[PDB]
Amino acid sequence: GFTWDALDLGDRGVLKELYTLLNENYVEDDDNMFRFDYSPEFLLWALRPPGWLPQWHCGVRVVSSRKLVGFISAIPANIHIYDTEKKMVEINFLCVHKKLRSKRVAPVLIREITRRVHLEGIFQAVYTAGVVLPKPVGTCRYWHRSLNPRKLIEVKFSHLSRNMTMQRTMKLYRLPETPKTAGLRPMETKDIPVVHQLLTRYLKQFHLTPVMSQEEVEHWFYPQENIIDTFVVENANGEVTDFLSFYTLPSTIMNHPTHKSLKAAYSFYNVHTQTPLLDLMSDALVLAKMKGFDVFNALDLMENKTFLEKLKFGIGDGNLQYYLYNWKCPSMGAEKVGIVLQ
Numbered sequence: 087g088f089t090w091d092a093l094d095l096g097d098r099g100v101l102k103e104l105y106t107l108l109n110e111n112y113v114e115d116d117d118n119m120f121r122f123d124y125s126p127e128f129l130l131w132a133l134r135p136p137g138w139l140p141q142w143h144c145g146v147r148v149v150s151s152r153k154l155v156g157f158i159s160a161i162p163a164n165i166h167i168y169d170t171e172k173k174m175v176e177i178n179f180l181c182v183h184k185k186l187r188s189k190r191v192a193p194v195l196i197r198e199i200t201r202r203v204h205l206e207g208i209f210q211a212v213y214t215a216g217v218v219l220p221k222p223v224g225t226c227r228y229w230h231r232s233l234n235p236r237k238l239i240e241v242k243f244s245h246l247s248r249n250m251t252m253q254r255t256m257k258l259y260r261l262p263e264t265p266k267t268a269g270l271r272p273m274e275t276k277d278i279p280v281v282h283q284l285l286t287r288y289l290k291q292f293h294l295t296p297v298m299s300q301e302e303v304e305h306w307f308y309p310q311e312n313i314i315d316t317f318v319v320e321n322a323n324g325e326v327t328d329f330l331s332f333y334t335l336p337s338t339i340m341n342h343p344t345h346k347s348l349k350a351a352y353s354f355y356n357v358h359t360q361t362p363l364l365d366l367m368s369d370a371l372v373l374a375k376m377k378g379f380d381v382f383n384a385l386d387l388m389e390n391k392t393f394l395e396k397l398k399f400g401i402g403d404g405n406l407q408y409y410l411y412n413w414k415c416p417s418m419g420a421e422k423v424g425i426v427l428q
Contacts, residue, residue: 092145211411
């Protein structure tokens, strides 16, 4: 029969077949043809934060042996909803093999990690999903800004309006070869606590935010070449600053001429002191582009809805929604959502 359990993370041989799963499984595509291709390392950046536990990377193999067919993460967090900071967890990566003809899988594959967590007291859960669910807390929507238009037009991810030449479109979505912000410089190792304290007071204005430690803001922020970026803005002789961050997350491709995948550039967080971030967000586009990216995808967060539309952002394939498992409380607009849980 089946009432299985497992584990997965760290080891090369394992981890690989693991992303193999999500590679051609964890989909959220539509008419077109493409799902989130997951990087070997990236996973570790997300699946291994400070305080993670082995029994939360559940696995599932076919009655046989050499057959992984299911997964689900659950990285430890410390949400902030009501007038309180409830230590909760962020559940993610819930997949099920493709050809699997069993609907009595996830319904157990789900309640399993629920028990596994309810053992450390973390009875509260946090996550988002490319689907609908009864009691939602939020409902954001993705945007863009082609850093390689002729490509999207070439494939089928994006297209030119009515009579828009495959040339003017470019001119429009053009970009300078050098930032228009003086001080923009990659975050050093010693810039960690400066990104912790600077982000804890800032983020400290949203109804739902991920409180982090000097080590956490040290994990989802310190630069890594093919995972996540973060350029701080040091001042003159001092240190005072603001900064931007965008975790790479390329999506697999499909039927195309001879084009490569799709180097994605989703946005993580962005904290400008007082100075308007309408440029802190633009530079990002100049970075993601100068770094060889095809698009900068930014969701909602208060101050996002601002610079968004007043900048080359529009198309919205769909919309991501936020939820809370065992907590009851009122809802808010995108302007209040802080947690950028992938």
